[PDB]
From Swiss-Prot:
Energy-transfer acceptor. Its role is to transduce the blue chemiluminescence of the protein aequorin into green fluorescent light by energy transfer. Fluoresces in vivo upon receiving energy from the Ca(2+)-activated photoprotein aequorin. This is Green fluorescent protein. Changing residue 219 to G: Suppresses the 399 nm excitation peak, leaving only the longer wavelength peak at 475 nm. Gene3D superfamilies: Green fluorescent protein. It comes from Aequorea victoria. Keywords: Chromophore, Luminescence, Photoprotein. Belongs to the GFP family. GO terms for biological process: bioluminescence; generation of precursor metabolites and energy. Monomer.
Length: 226
């Protein structure tokens, strides 16, 4: 049993902190909850702390800890994410919304004591003021996706590619193309994986007693040799 995997054997508290800027509209999101990697399960509540969120919350889901994925016993050697802990890894993405703007994100995820922390900076540009994103035309739900993972031996890390389908209110879909790079923060040995995928499902909801702009989130992720 590896060092990284032992950190995740039980329930781990999670803290998420995001600072964003989309077309100049600034905002901060704080999140709290917990992760149970044994079942690939995340439970989290996110609050926009600067008031009204200038984008739809669902567009932030991928940005807002894949170290909580479940790798089945036979795939444990492909779990780059836990192998980088506790020192952690940096996760960077470009998210490109079809016929609209893009997010660029840089995040550091690591332990601070017993807590798994995801700290993110986000910058969005090229967004249409009347588009699906700034126009808040996205439905408040979330589809299931396959995140595809390849080793990046040269950087001792991984890359990932996938397309998020955001249900639009008129019945169409808003496509968000994700290109992602992860590299370790420490220089201990990490696991470099063969091609595989993270099968992820996400359920979004609301706390009727919470008046602040927020998102409650339940997620299940399983690694598959698919």
């Amino acid at each position: 049993k590896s060092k990284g995997e032992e950190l995740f054997a039980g329930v781990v508290p999670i803290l998420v902190e995001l600072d964003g800027d989309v077309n100049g509209h600034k905002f901060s999101v704080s999140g709290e909850g917990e992760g149970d990697a044994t079942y690939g399960k995340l439970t989290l509540k996110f609050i926009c702390t600067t008031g009204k969120l200038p984008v739809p919350f669902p567009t932030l889901v991928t940005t807002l800890v894949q170290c909580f994925s479940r790798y089945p016993d036979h795939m444990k050697r492909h779990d780059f994410f836990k192998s980088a802990m506790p020192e952690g890894y940096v996760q960077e993405r470009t998210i490109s919304f079809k016929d609209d703007g893009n997010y660029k994100t840089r995040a550091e995820v690591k332990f601070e004591g017993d807590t798994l922390v995801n700290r993110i900076e986000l910058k969005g540009i090229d967004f249409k003021e009347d588009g699906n994103i700034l126009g808040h035309k996205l439905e408040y739900n979330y589809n299931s996706h396959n995140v595809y993972i390849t080793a990046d031996k040269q950087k001792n890390g991984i890359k990932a590619n996938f397309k998020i389908r955001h249900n639009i209110e008129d019945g169409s879909v808003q496509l968000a193309d994700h290109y992602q790079q992860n590299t370790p923060i420490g220089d201990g040995p990490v696991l470099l994986p063969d091609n595989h995928c993270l099968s992820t499902q996400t359920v979004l909801s609301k706390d009727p007693n919470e008046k602040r702009d927020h998102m409650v989130l339940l997620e299940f992720v399983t690694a598959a040799g698919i």
